[model samples]
Target: GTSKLKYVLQDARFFLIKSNNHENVSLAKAKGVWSTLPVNEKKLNLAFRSARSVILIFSVRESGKFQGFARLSSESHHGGSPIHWVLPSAKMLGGVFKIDWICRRELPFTKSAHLTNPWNEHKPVKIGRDGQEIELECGTQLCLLFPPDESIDLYQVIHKM
Candidate 1:
């Protein structure tokens, strides 16, 4: 039991404020909150410079809870990308559009350009740093990263309606 709950927030990096309606909540409810006893309570300060629109998502087994959001502004948060941090509570409004593209580039050798995260800044797709120069294809959206000449990268673009 200890192991399961031990590292709950260990790898916690950033919160995905559902990009659907990234709006603001009322100040009254934004005072402050304390998560389970496991999570430090005093660590959270409701006094935020700005709060982006986010939704609370919870699994069926666990009760939904809300503590606070990242202490970053929402405007420049997404790295200037339209890719929204889908709010936990921001369920799929409707089947929007999903685009999949295959960016193929064959080369003998050379360093590739990196694609920056325009949509999702919290998560970055670093080509060389994260791993290596590879290829991929899928349906998604939220950012970009240009690879080296000798490398080919895949892209999955998704946007809200």
Candidate 2:
């Protein structure tokens, strides 16, 4: 007699990193390391240890669109350190992590909006109380988003590169 076992398929988790400047985005793509505030150590570490990916998105100061994406390497260095190359102002608050670039595209803001929104439930666009429009805020150097229903398809498309 033998016992039966089952396995569950898990989709990769998604996170977004907001880049305020195009130069920083290019530098990140070049250096393969992203610096963040130490407050993200726990989640970054988890992302490093888990099957997750981080998408690089630009802020209003930049293109205000999706740039590219990558995954945190297991060798990510947390704690405080000098990251003057990327962020010159601060020397501490280092949560720098090595990234494995996945997809690099200069998609239009509107085109990327469709990819970020899942079933139109969590639209990146928000109507403000003042009747102005606002975009989704990560509220930090980096933030996480669950893998939406189309995540698998998105992954396959991006991973093609």
Candidate 3:
């Protein structure tokens, strides 16, 4: 199937590195990367600038694989936003989060984590681009719990990007 390439990479630096409170996590490193066509490896050379840390995610034809990561001098964006690009291995179709890889068990706690209160099944929450800079993180796992007293925009995407 042919479809416009689509994917999301939440700049997790806010929670793990950007915030003054955020720390240099040796326990868990983060990065952003994309695979290119067979003859175009140089395209990714100038992708990201200098950053404290980074994580690269690759997506291939009918393949869900974790290619590995590298040290980035910075992020792919000047504003430090997620590095958005149309990768080669990324079929013209799109991408999706391989949750099984990031969070073996996803728990949408808090009242609004899930569409419905009971987080028994995947309720198909349409990842909307509408939110007031929402930044969320799990110190040790995949439980997105936001404090009611604050507002930030940040979400992780462990998808086939």
Best prediction by TM-score? 2
Error of 3 at 118 (Å): 18
Once model 3 is optimally superposed onto the true structure by TM-score, how far is the C-alpha of residue 37 displaced, in angstroms?
A: 12
- Model 1 Cα displacement at 89 (Å)? 11
Ranking by lDDT: 2, 3, 1
Model 2 steric clash pairs = none
lDDT of the structure predicted as candidate 2: 0.44
Our tally of clashes for model 3 stands at 19
lDDT of 2 by residue, 1-161 (tens): 00100001123444445555677778777776777656555666665465433333333234645565555554456564444554435655555776655445544455433332332345553111111212223211122222122222333423422
List ranges where model 1 is wrong by over 4 Å.
Answer: 1-11, 25-29, 33-68, 71-161
Q: What are the lDDT scores of the predictions, listed in order?
A: 0.20, 0.44, 0.23
Put down candidate 3 lDDT per residue, 68-96, tens digits, no spaces. Answer: 11223322222233333433233431221
TM-score of 3: 0.20
Model 1, 13-94: lDDT tens per residue?
Answer: 2222212121222221232111211121111112112222111111111212111221211111111212223234223221
Better of 2 and 3 by lDDT: 2
Candidate 2 residue spans exceeding 4 A from truth = 1-10, 52-60, 78-82, 86-88, 115-121, 125-161
Best by lDDT: 2
The TM-score of predicted model 2 comes to 0.56
